[PDB]
Amino acid sequence: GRMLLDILKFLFIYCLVLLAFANGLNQLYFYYETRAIDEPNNCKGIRCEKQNNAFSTLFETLQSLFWSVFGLLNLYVTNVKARHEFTEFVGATMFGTYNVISLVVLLNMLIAMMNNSYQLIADHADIEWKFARTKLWMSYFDEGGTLPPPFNI
Amino acid sequence: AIRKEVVGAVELLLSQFSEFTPDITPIMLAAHTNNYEIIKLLVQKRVTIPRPHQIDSLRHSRSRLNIYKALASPSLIALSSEDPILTAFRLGWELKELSKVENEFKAEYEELSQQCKLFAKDLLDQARSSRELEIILNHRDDLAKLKVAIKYHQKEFVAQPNCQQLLATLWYDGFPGWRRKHWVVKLLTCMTIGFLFPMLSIAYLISPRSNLGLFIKKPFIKFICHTASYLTFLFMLLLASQHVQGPPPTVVEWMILPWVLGFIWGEIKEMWDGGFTEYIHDWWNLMDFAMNSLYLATISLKIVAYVKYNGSRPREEWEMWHPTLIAEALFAISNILSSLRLISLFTANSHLGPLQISLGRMLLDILKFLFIYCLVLLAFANGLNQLYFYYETRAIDEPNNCKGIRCEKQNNAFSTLFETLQSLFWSVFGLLNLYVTNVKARHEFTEFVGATMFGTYNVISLVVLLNMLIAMMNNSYQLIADHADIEWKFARTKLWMSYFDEGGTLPPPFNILIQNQHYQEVIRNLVKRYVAAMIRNSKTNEGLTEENFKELKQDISSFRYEVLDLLG
Amino acid sequence: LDQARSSRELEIILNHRDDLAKLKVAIKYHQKEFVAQPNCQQLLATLWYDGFPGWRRKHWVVKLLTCMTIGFLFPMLSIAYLISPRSNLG
Amino acid sequence: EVIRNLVKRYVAAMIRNSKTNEGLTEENFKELKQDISSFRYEVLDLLG
Ligand SMILES: CCCCCCCCCCCCCCCC(=O)OC[C@H](COP(=O)(O)O)OC(=O)CCCCCCCCCCCCCCC
Numbered sequence: 022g023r024m025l026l027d028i029l030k031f032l033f034i035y036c037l038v039l040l041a042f043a044n045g046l047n048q049l050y051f052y053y054e055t056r057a058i059d060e061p062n063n064c065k066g067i068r069c070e071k072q073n074n075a076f077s078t079l080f081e082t083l084q085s086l087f088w089s090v091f092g093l094l095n096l097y098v099t100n101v102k103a104r105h106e107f108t109e110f111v112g113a114t115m116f117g118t119y120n121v122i123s124l125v126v127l128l129n130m131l132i133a134m135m136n137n138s139y140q141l142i143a144d145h146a147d148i149e150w151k152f153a154r155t156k157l158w159m160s161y162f163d164e165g166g167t168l169p170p171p172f173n174i
Numbered sequence: 175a176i177r178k179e180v181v182g183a184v185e186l187l188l189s190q191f192s193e194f195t196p197d198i199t200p201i202m203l204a205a206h207t208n209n210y211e212i213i214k215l216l217v218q219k220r221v222t223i224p225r226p227h228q229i230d231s232l233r234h235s236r237s238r239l240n241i242y243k244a245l246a247s248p249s250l251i252a253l254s255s256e257d258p259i260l261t262a263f264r265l266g267w268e269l270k271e272l273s274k275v276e277n278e279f280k281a282e283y284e285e286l287s288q289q290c291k292l293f294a295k296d297l298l299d300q301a302r303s304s305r306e307l308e309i310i311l312n313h314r315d316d317l318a319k320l321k322v323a324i325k326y327h328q329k330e331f332v333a334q335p336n337c338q339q340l341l342a343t344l345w346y347d348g349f350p351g352w353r354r355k356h357w358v359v360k361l362l363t364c365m366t367i368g369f370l371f372p373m374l375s376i377a378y379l380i381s382p383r384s385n386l387g388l389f390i391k392k393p394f395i396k397f398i399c400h401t402a403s404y405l406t407f408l409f410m411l412l413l414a415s416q417h418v419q420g421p422p423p424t425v426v427e428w429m430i431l432p433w434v435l436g437f438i439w440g441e442i443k444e445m446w447d448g449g450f451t452e453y454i455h456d457w458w459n460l461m462d463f464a465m466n467s468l469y470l471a472t473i474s475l476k477i478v479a480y481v482k483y484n485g486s487r488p489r490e491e492w493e494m495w496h497p498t499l500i501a502e503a504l505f506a507i508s509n510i511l512s513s514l515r516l517i518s519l520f521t522a523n524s525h526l527g528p529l530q531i532s533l534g535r536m537l538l539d540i541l542k543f544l545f546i547y548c549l550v551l552l553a554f555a556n557g558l559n560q561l562y563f564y565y566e567t568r569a570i571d572e573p574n575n576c577k578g579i580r581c582e583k584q585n586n587a588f589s590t591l592f593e594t595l596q597s598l599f600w601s602v603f604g605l606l607n608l609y610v611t612n613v614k615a616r617h618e619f620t621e622f623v624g625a626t627m628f629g630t631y632n633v634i635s636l637v638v639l640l641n642m643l644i645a646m647m648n649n650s651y652q653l654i655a656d657h658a659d660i661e662w663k664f665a666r667t668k669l670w671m672s673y674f675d676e677g678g679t680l681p682p683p684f685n686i687l688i689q690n691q692h693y694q695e696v697i698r699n700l701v702k703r704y705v706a707a708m709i710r711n712s713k714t715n716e717g718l719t720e721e722n723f724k725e726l727k728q729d730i731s732s733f734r735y736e737v738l739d740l741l742g
Numbered sequence: 743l744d745q746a747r748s749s750r751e752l753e754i755i756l757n758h759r760d761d762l763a764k765l766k767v768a769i770k771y772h773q774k775e776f777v778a779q780p781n782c783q784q785l786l787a788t789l790w791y792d793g794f795p796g797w798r799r800k801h802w803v804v805k806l807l808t809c810m811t812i813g814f815l816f817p818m819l820s821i822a823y824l825i826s827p828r829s830n831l832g
Numbered sequence: 833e834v835i836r837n838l839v840k841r842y843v844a845a846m847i848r849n850s851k852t853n854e855g856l857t858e859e860n861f862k863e864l865k866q867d868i869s870s871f872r873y874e875v876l877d878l879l880g
């Protein structure tokens with residue numbers, strides 16, 4: 022719980038990064054939206070068997086760059102039907118630098134950040150723990166002992 | 175007698191195995207011992223010190239290290255110098271560059287440079303009023319002494335908290351107690367001043383000398399509504415992403431073009447100042463050159479695409495090097511570079527600042543590692559291209575007329591060198607597959623050898639080198655996280671002090687002898703109470719040693735033999 | 743080695759055969775602090791950069807240009823010392 | 833001729849470093865205590 026507040030200072034910067042690359046990839050691939058009828062099983066976007074239009078809208082692009090932190094996108098995502106090899110290559114390099122920044126740089130900087138925070142937290146532990154244990158204990162000293170299992174009414 | 179700080183050097187100034195290099199004069203050793211009384215007793219004898227510069231080799235570097243070791247003492251800077259703050263600054267710089275020149279003796283010249291920085295910082299610690307502090311920080315040989323302190327990279331001098339209070343009152347002028355306010359009131363002032371950048375920037379164009387023309391002259395009212403304006407520009411870039419070969423510009427692009435011209439005129443306005451020395455050394459200005467250069471390339475390819483491309487062809491019939499597609503791709507990359515400039519706005523915030531500057535100080539330690547990893551990339555791509563270059567298949571032979579990776583069927587990854595480097599890049603993440611390393615010709619030995627080469631690439635790159643990068647950033651982040659909050663405040667005073675100058679208007683498109691007597695009168699008091707504080711700290715903090723035991727032993731022994739000689 | 747206050751003394755130390763004999767014995771017995779002592783590193787650096795007055799004083803772009811232009815000339819510097827060893831290029 | 837000088841100024845530097853860097857201990861306290869005590873009994877034995 023004392024390291025979560027140090028993660029939340031970092032997710033703002035990472036969300037700043039997602040915003041950046043979603044702005045770029047939406048700007049590059051918004052010309053290539055296809056209707057849902059044109060793909061098999063009448064399915065559009067990611068969460069399809071055929072990952073078809075991920076960088077089409079801004080919400081689907083934010084989603085797309087979210088799911089690529091884990092190994093859940095594919096390289097056939099960055100293609101278009103129109104076979105434009107320069108824009109598909111530039112989009113794949115934008116997706117590659119997102120993968121380097123988000124997965125190699127920022128994730129391991131978050132690891133080092135939580136090492137240095139966990140070393141500072143783990144000294145003041147067992148008096149930080151006992152304060153919360155006395156708050157939990159001292160919440161049950163009061164007169165209101167009626168049970169929330171509906172006996173409370 | 176000078177080594178032991180005995181003031182029985184008055185007798186030796188009154189009236190073969192030297193344990194010193196014979197370059198040592200008494201004032202060099204007096205400065206090495208840092209005793210103020212002996213240095214005063216020898217400076218009152220009018221002795222000199224050589225200047226180090228030149229037109230068998232251990233005596234030369236040893237003697238130069240003795241000369242710079244004596245000049246870097248905080249008592250020869252406190253005495254015999256016109257102002258000790260500029261002397262500590264210039265000596266800190268000359269010892270830092272002199273440590274960078276000589277690979278040997280680096281850890282000693284860096285120690286002397288940190289001594290020179292710590293001395294000047296301890297001179298600011300002795301200022302006990304704000305008239306004294308304003309006489310210090312304004313002394314032109316504006317805030318001249320802070321510009322010189324940032325120029326010579328004096329990070330402990332600037333991050334000293336009295337200087338931070340003075341810079342904070344210069345920063346928040348027109349705000350009685352901004353830090354006393356609650357952060358919701360802070361957020362409402364940031365937002366409501368953020369919306370009014372045309373209402374605060376049309377004034378200072380029509381009425382500069384007015385009640386509103388003097389309101390954007392405040393630097394915190396520069397920072398807010400220079401950066402909320404940038405958030406409106408990035409809002410226009412978000413709006414821009416929501417067939418003609420070369421089209422006329424969109425209404426969004428017509429709104430965006432003078433923002434872009436305000437950025438380019440702003441950066442040319444910064445390249446007129448100084449030269450390509452401070453500009454090109456700053457990474458964010460290099461990122462401004464990349465961003466604005468891609469803006470010039472994008473707008474130029476819109477103009478080229480508008481010229482003599484009159485017809486309309488469908489999108490899937492265009493050539494690969496059509497300047498419309500290149501203008502859209504470079505526009506997207508410039509949107510990534512323009513939308514990553516908000517990371518530089520973190521130094522103004524007290525929570526995100528030291529984090530951002532710690533990440534920036536670990537990036538230079540990652541870039542030393544990506545060279546080694548790229549060598550590994552070159553090694554295994556050489557091997558896998560060499561093994562699989564016999565098995566190239568044409569794009570017609572696969573389904574959907576697709577070749578390489580970025581296909582549904584990952585077919586020819588180790589075919590060319592360019593695709594093999596791309597293949598070993600994408601396998602760091604879980605994005606290749608094991609069907610990649612096959613050939614159509616069913617050669618099980620070469621497919622097995624290629625899969626073992628791919629496996630050792632995965633062990634070296636993912637298990638060995640990635641976790642060595644993790645341990646590397648642990649050990650670097652522990653070293654960086656001690657000097658944070660003075661490394662952060664130096665960059666925050668550079669960001670603050672960038673908004674103190676004359677050129678106030680935003681890039682939204684609107685863009686288009688008495689002093690020396692008072693200073694010596696302050697410096698004399700600071701040196702006097704500094705030296706008093708340092709001898710006080712030497713009395714409190716010096717632990718006792720064996721020679722102090724020998725002094726008491728000789729006092730009791732000599733008094734013993736003297737009483738026995740009187741009574742005998 | 744820290745007590746050597748001249749380079750005649752340091753060259754008498756590091757050349758003492760019971761060439762650089764005492765450094766070969768120091769590397770042979772894995773004496774890593776002896777060799778990494780900075781006066782020894784200055785002597786090895788002057789033996790290393792002979793024919794370069796102040797290589798470390800130069801800027802790294804000039805260093806890169808000397809590394810590249812001396813790098814291209816390995817036939818022009820290796821055909822000499824095969825035909826004319828005792829020459830200005832050999 | 834070089835080794836003799838290096839050994840001589842080495843040993844001088846090491847006894848110098850032992851004088852500077854050795855912290856005081858309890859037996860050094862007992863030495864001062866016996867010096868003042870023995871000088872005390874010697875003066876009391878001369879004046880008695
Ligand atoms: C603090 C905020 C964030 C800090 C910013 C981070 C600093 C930037 C880090 C480097 C920038 C990313 C490099 C570009 C990625 C790319 O090239 O993108 C790779 C692209 C993407 O694939 P394509 O072939 O489809 O384009 O591939 C190529 O263009 C061919 C060249 C491949 C060679 C790349 C070698 C670089 C590898 C470095 C990372 C290796 C991972 C480490 C494993 C241990």
Ligand SMILES: CCCCCCCCCCCCCCCC(=O)OC[C@H](COP(=O)(O)O)OC(=O)CCCCCCCCCCCCCCC
Nearest residue numbers: 621622623624625626627628629630631633634637638639
């Ligand atoms: C500083 C620069 C870089 C430093 C160099 C790094 C040192 C080298 C590290 C070891 C070399 C790689 C080993 C070869 C990989 C390989 O065998 O490649 C594995 C190959 C590849 O699969 P194929 O069967 O398809 O060829 O598999 C086999 O040949 C069958 C044997 C499998 C048993 C392998 C057991 C070794 C596993 C070690 C890594 C485990 C990961 C750790 C997880 C916690």
Ligand SMILES: CC(C)CCC[C@@H](C)[C@H]1CC[C@H]2[C@@H]3CC=C4C[C@@H](OC(=O)CCC(=O)O)CC[C@]4(C)[C@H]3CC[C@]12C
Nearest residue numbers: 033036037040364401405516517519520522523524526
């Ligand atoms: C949520 C994700 C999508 C990022 C949101 C993008 C922007 C809305 C955020 C990213 C970083 C934020 C910035 C982070 C830090 C600052 C400094 C901050 O100022 C302070 O913290 C105090 C200033 C002072 O007192 O000196 C107010 C604006 C600003 C630019 C913030 C403005 C809003 C920014 C640009």
Ligand code: NA
Nearest residue numbers: 444458459462
């Ligand atoms: Na700039």
Ligand code: NA
Nearest residue numbers: 091092603604
């Ligand atoms: Na994975």
